[PDB]
Amino acid sequence: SFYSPVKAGDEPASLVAIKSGPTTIGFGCRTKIEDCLLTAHHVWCNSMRPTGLAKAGKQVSVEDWEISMSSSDKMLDFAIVRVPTHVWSKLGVKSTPLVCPSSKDVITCYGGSSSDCLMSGVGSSSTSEFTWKLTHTCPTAAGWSGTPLYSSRGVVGMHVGFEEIGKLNRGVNMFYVANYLLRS
């Protein structure tokens, strides 16, 4: 009801699913921070090992790729991974820039329990006086961690969890993180 099905090929070109054997452990996007996969720390580092990247039924295995940066802070919860560029093209994944979030962004969020079985939510996203923090109303589920907060203007942030469970959700503002927190 709060969700619409999404046919493979109709999700954004940046969106990628993160698999651990049969299990989708979360989502991510291709972006620039150099060029990278951005997902949640708990998807990439605190779940069962990532073994593959999936997009629309297409699959590529995960090899010993470098984790450029990560934070296991509940409030940041990010992992920035250097995926060889051929893997991105094998999947047909196109980059998308991290745009600056605002007081109110209209957002779509995508997730599912398999690469080819995707659905979409809609909500709004808002910045905090705690600059690293976003809160949003996009309906998500278990396994939707690392999924980008897409606006018409672009990816404003990354979904990581809850603010209050089922009332208000939580993102990390990766724009602020990349500009003020991360060291080159």
Side-chain angles (χ1 to χ4, degrees), residues 1-6 8-31 33 35-45 47-65 67-73 75-89 91-93 95-103 105-166 168-173 175-184:
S1 157
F2 300 89
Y3 303 97
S4 307
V6 183
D10 282 331
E11 75 278 5
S14 47
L15 192 67
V16 89
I18 292 141
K19 282 284 214 212
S20 178
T23 315
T24 303
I25 52 175
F27 292 83
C29 71
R30 199 195 177 186
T31 188
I33 278 162
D35 172 70
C36 70
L37 159 77
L38 162 73
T39 189
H41 173 279
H42 87 260
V43 177
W44 199 261
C45 295
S47 300
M48 275 200 275
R49 299 171 181 252
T51 48
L53 291 193
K55 186 164 175 74
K58 301 157 86 166
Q59 181 90 217
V60 280
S61 53
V62 171
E63 326 280 329
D64 64 330
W65 305 333
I67 303 98
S68 162
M69 249 301 271
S70 65
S71 162
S72 65
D73 192 305
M75 298 314 284
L76 299 174
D77 195 2
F78 70 78
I80 298 157
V81 180
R82 283 177 167 184
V83 180
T85 170
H86 69 262
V87 181
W88 287 137
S89 45
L91 264 301
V93 187
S95 204
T96 292
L98 265 12
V99 173
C100 190
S102 73
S103 325
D105 290 317
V106 183
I107 50 154
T108 315
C109 51
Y110 299 79
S113 52
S114 80
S115 61
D116 47 40
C117 196
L118 211 67
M119 58 184 160
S120 84
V122 191
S124 48
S125 186
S126 307
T127 39
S128 270
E129 69 279 347
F130 301 101
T131 331
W132 55 87
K133 183 173 151 194
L134 301 178
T135 55
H136 74 87
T137 53
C138 212
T140 55
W144 291 46
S145 273
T147 208
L149 269 23
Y150 288 102
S151 297
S152 52
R153 188 187 37 154
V155 177
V156 292
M158 180 176 61
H159 176 68
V160 292
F162 309 88
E163 185 67 3
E164 174 201 333
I165 330 92
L168 192 61
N169 295 145
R170 198 184 83 258
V172 56
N173 169 1
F175 189 82
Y176 164 83
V177 175
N179 281 158
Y180 296 91
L181 269 42
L182 300 174
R183 280 185 194 280
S184 277

